[PDB]
């Protein structure tokens, strides 16, 4: 974590090692490897565990930080507790090591105690396996509402829950680490004086030490007639912001992804989006359905590769050597007189009825290093997270079919199978049958039924900038608006959604996506490129658009009169639309008082129907239990005789 | 029908006033049909004009650079004299 982004499961991994290495003895005042395999504990609905010598079983953790209890994948999330009361130096983090050690101490005051902990403890949660992103971020959550200055670099200021738990469930920052007192630590670059050894200048700071260092996030690209040391930059000090000379700076924050969580760090051009849309974007990316065919984004942040590696979805070699044999089911790798057979997951159901499936990424005779990729899982191409598709998009109103968040799409996304996904539903019949819930029986143990779902009206799509939409209309390709090269667009988004939501980053992404597709390029851009120069994103996008226009002889791609926009034509009539329209190829994902109103209208008989009496008869009996009687009498207006209603 | 001939522009407050006058003059059954026709006309024209939004359309006023640079200069001078002890911290905070 000193010169690379740390493994996203490192907190879970190191905590479990501490429990085995030191935690067991502290509570006991031998461990035997499990007899079954992890895939067996899932197939037989058993528990992956080790034998303590026979005191009982101790559940073991996977390298991905997950436990297998009664066949269910479970993750123990981190809790933050009181050790300014909201300062993180007065808080402490209790990880899986603290929780598993408490259970062992509770157990010694061994099997049923851990089965009951994983099944009932609120910090033990079923792993969200919707997509590779959901698996990796679940274990990094912090459970307890305001942002505190001590959070910077440790707790993400954007990623939180929506509803009533907002500000009480957060995410750990990408470079965060748990210290030796349950404290969160973040790395900073130390500016050292002339006379000091200073082997490693990267140091981790606990929240207590943070206030008393001068921490700057600016750069040193500024010179006047004076000297560089006297130039001023914004810095943090004593939980406030100053403007001081460089020579008074103690530390520098240099990591591009230091201050944000994984979800926020997957948003290109995030600095051009309002911070509220970046929160909504993090939630939407956790709802993205893996597609039957996967495709890398043209424009990314560069963190997609880290998510793929740490998720465990792909297959990575545990040993170097050469590839000898590959098929749909296995890959055979041999190195240094040792041959290994690696099975491949095929059409496996996940927690949320999504389809997991691995495809080989290597051929026979290819040399492999230890830790290199072998196969691509679902929503992963070439070792990168791939949650969506790059499609041709225009921003314009279209006859009210994209009113508000409604989205108009072309039929080519349907018959092209662009957004078709597999969904395997398990119900607790001959194999391969077509039952009618329509689908195909794929595995009988429990019956597993596979559904191929193409995109439909009513489905929800979203970009990475909090731009979420619902498909309202599917048009033939000849009815869609089309470009000056004749190609019809695939989706039409409402342009009125951008100014109100203030997410300009989608405008940068779509233009750059179009340039990349024409130039056969992908872009991985770290956030906050404005630190290099003013309008850095605008310079990057416009220059790449012009290069795409020049190289491919497509002048409409870069119009000097209005860069990024071009005149397009109505497919129905062939006439051009009056004003130029922004077009591009963004990455789009596919996602998984009434009584008073009636009384105000005076609709008395409608209200009576919607209420119907058993509600009142049951009320009388409950009042009778308190020695109270509630009698309903009708007095006749004709003869004044009182009638007791049968209640 | 003795409708007045508008000849300048129809914005949000102008259409709201017109609908209220149509309701008071023609009643709600007439105005409900008028609303459907006006709604259709607005959607059709919005599509034909095809308003959009690009980077260039996000126009900053010409004088922002002058104004920001002037504010930076005054803040920079005050920060120096704060370090000299000529103004106190509350004065720097207010400015």
């Amino acid at each position: 974590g000193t010169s690379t982004i740390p493994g996203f499961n490192q907190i879970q991994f190191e905590g479990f090692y501490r429990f085995i290495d030191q935690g067991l003895i502290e509570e006991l005042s031998q461990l035997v490897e499990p007899l079954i395999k992890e895939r067996d504990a899932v197939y037989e609905s058993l528990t992956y565990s080790s034998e303590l010598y026979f005191i009982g079983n101790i559940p073991l953790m996977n390298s991905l930080g997950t436990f297998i209890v009664n066949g269910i994948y479970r993750v123990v999330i981190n809790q933050i507790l009181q050790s300014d009361m909201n300062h993180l130096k007065n808080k402490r983090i209790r990880s899986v090591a603290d929780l598993l050690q408490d259970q062992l101490g509770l157990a010694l005051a061994l099997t049923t105690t851990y089965e009951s902990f994983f099944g009932l403890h609120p910090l033990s949660q079923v792993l969200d396996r919707t997509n590779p992103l959901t698996q990796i971020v679940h274990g990094r959550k912090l459970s307890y509402r305001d942002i505190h200055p001590s959070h910077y670099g440790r707790i993400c200021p954007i990623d939180t829950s929506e509803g009533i738990n907002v500000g009480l469930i957060g995410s750990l920052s990408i470079h965060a680490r748990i210290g030796d007192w349950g404290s969160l630590e973040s790395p900073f670059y130390e500016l050292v004086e002339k006379s000091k050894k200073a082997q490693i200048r990267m140091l981790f700071l606990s929240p207590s030490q943070d206030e008393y260092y001068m921490i700057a996030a600016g750069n040193s690209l500024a010179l006047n007639r004076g000297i560089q040391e006297e130039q001023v930059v914004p810095a943090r000090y004593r939980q406030e912001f100053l403007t001081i000379a460089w020579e008074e700076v103690h530390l520098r924050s240099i990591f591009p992804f230091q201050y944000f969580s994984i979800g926020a760090s997957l948003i290109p051009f995030i600095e051009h989006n309002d911070a509220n849309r970046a929160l909504m974007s993090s939630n939407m990316q956790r709802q993205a359905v893996p597609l039957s065919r996967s495709e890398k984004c043209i424009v990314g942040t560069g963190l997609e590769r880290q998510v793929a590696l740490d998720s465990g979805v792909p297959a990575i070699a545990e040993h170097e050597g050469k590839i000898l044999y590959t098929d749909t089911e296995k890959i055979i790798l041999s190195g240094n007189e040792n041959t290994l057979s690696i099975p491949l997951i095929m059409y496996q159901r996940s927690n949320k009825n999504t389809c997991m499936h691995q495809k080989p990424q290597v051929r026979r005779g290819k040399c492999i290093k230890k830790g290199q990729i072998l196969a691509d899982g679902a929503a992963t191409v070439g070792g990168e997270l791939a949650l969506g598709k790059n499609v041709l998009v225009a921003y314009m109103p279209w006859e009210g079919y994209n009113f508000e968040d409604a989205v108009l799409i072309s039929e080519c996304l349907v018959y092209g199978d662009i957004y078709t996904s597999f969904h395997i539903r398990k119900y607790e019949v001959m194999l391969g049958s077509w039952v009618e819930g329509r689908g195909r029986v794929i595995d009988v143990r429990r019956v597993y039924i596979s559904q191929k779902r193409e995109i439909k009206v009513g489905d929800k799509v979203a970009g990475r900038h909090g731009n979420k939409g619902i498909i309202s209309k599917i048009l033939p390709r000849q009815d869609m608006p089309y470009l000056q090269d004749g190609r019809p667009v695939d989706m039409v988004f409402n342009p009125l959604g951008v100014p109100s939501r203030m997410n300009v980053g989608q405008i940068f992404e779509c233009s750059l996506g179009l340039a990349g597709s024409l130039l056969d390029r992908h872009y991985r851009i770290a956030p906050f490129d404005e630190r290099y120069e003013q309008e850095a994103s605008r310079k990057l996008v416009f220059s790449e658009l012009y290069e795409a226009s020049k190289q491919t002889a497509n002048p409409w791609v870069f119009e000097p009169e209005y860069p990024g926009k071009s005149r397009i034509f109505d497919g129905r009539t062939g006439d051009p639309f009056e004003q130029p329209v922004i077009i591009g190829k963004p990455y789009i994902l596919k996602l998984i008082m009434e009584v008073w109103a009636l009384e105000g209208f005076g609709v008395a008989h409608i209200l009576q129907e919607m209420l119907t009496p058993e509600s009142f008869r049951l009320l009388v009996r409950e009042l009778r239990s308190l020695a109270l009687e509630l009698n309903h009498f009708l007095v006749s207006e004709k003869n004044f005789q009182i009638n007791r209603k049968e209640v | 029908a003795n409708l007045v001939f508008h000849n300048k522009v129809i914005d949000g407050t102008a259409i709201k006033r017109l609908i209220s006058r149509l309701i008071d003059h023609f009643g709600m059954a007439y105005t409900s049909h008028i609303l459907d026709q006006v709604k259709t006309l607005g959607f059709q024209q919005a599509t034909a004009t095809s308003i959009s939004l690009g980077i260039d359309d996000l126009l900053t006023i010409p004088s922002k650079g002058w104004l920001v640079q002037d504010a930076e200069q005054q803040s920079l001078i005050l920060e120096k004299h704060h370090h000299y002890g000529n103004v106190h911290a509350v004065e720097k905070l207010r400015q």
């Binding site: 009113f403 409604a406 309202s472 409950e622 | -």
Partner: peptide, 28 residues
């Protein structure tokens, strides 16, 4: 009365007093 009666699972008993007290747009 003060501390209410509780069962073995540390739950306060409820008396009778406690008992009594998708859409898609169509422009056409």
């Amino acid at each position: 009365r003060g501390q209410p009666m509780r069962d073995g699972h540390n739950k306060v008993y409820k008396s009778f007093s406690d008992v009594i007290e998708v859409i898609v747009v169509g422009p056409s």
